[PDB]
Design a protein around this ligand. Structure first.
Ligand SMILES: [Cl-]
Ligand SMILES: [Cl-]
Ligand SMILES: [Cl-]
Ligand SMILES: [Cl-]
Lengths: 98, 98, 98
């Protein structure tokens, strides 16, 4: 029966080796996954930097438009004011004739 | 001869234990990868939310500039119209003199 | 000693099996991680394409504002120039009366 116990063990070992050989394939997979997570982390960081640049630039353009709006509204106000003054000079030139 | 079978079993086993001890290291590397994937997934989502904000804001500014453009074109044409009416009052005043 | 050597071996084998069963639980975890890294990679790319769109559009609005600026400032200068020539016609009309 010793000899049966031994044949039994030899089968278990053969099975075990076949299971281990399948499991060993994981080593290379895990390392590959680890490498791919790093690459993703590098792309994520680069997107974050580029989103920041865009955010900054949206904000400056927004400010820029606000400065332009003011600049123009003030020149328009000043031009309308000159026009009003000229209309008043023409009222007086008209009264001065008649 | 049994005894020889037993020694070669004991070396097969010694070898298996060394293989299993290497493979054991994978349990914690996999935990780590899983944690790092979650972190990356959190950053991806934050970038996605920030890209959305930026897209929204680009779109409002673009509309804003369009409103400002027309707003200005109208005031400029009102001004040109007042100028023309002044040019006509001066044609009169010149006539009215001679 | 033989039968003792055998009962020892059988429990070393029992433990290797327990260790292997613990390690076989990684197989699907590693597959799941791999699938999740691919998903993340897909989201990263999508974000990259949307950042590029946003970048392009920020830049065109920026240029657009620059074109609008000069367009208006030239129109305003032309209006100021018509106003000045109208002031001069009114200086003449005033001198022509008195
Ligand atoms: Cl990832
Ligand atoms: Cl993994
Ligand atoms: Cl991203
Ligand atoms: Cl963006």
């Amino acid at each position: 029966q010793i000899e049966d116990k031994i044949e039994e063990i030899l089968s278990k070992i053969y099975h075990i080796e076949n299971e281990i050989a399948r499991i060993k394939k994981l080593i290379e997979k895990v390392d590959q996954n680890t490498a791919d997570i790093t690459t993703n982390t590098n792309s994520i960081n680069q997107n974050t930097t580029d989103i920041a640049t865009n955010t900054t630039n949206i904000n400056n353009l927004s400010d820029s438009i606000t400065t332009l709006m003011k600049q123009i509204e003030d020149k328009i106000e000043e031009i309308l004011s000159k026009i009003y003054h000229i209309e008043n000079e023409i009222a007086r030139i008209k009264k001065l004739i008649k």
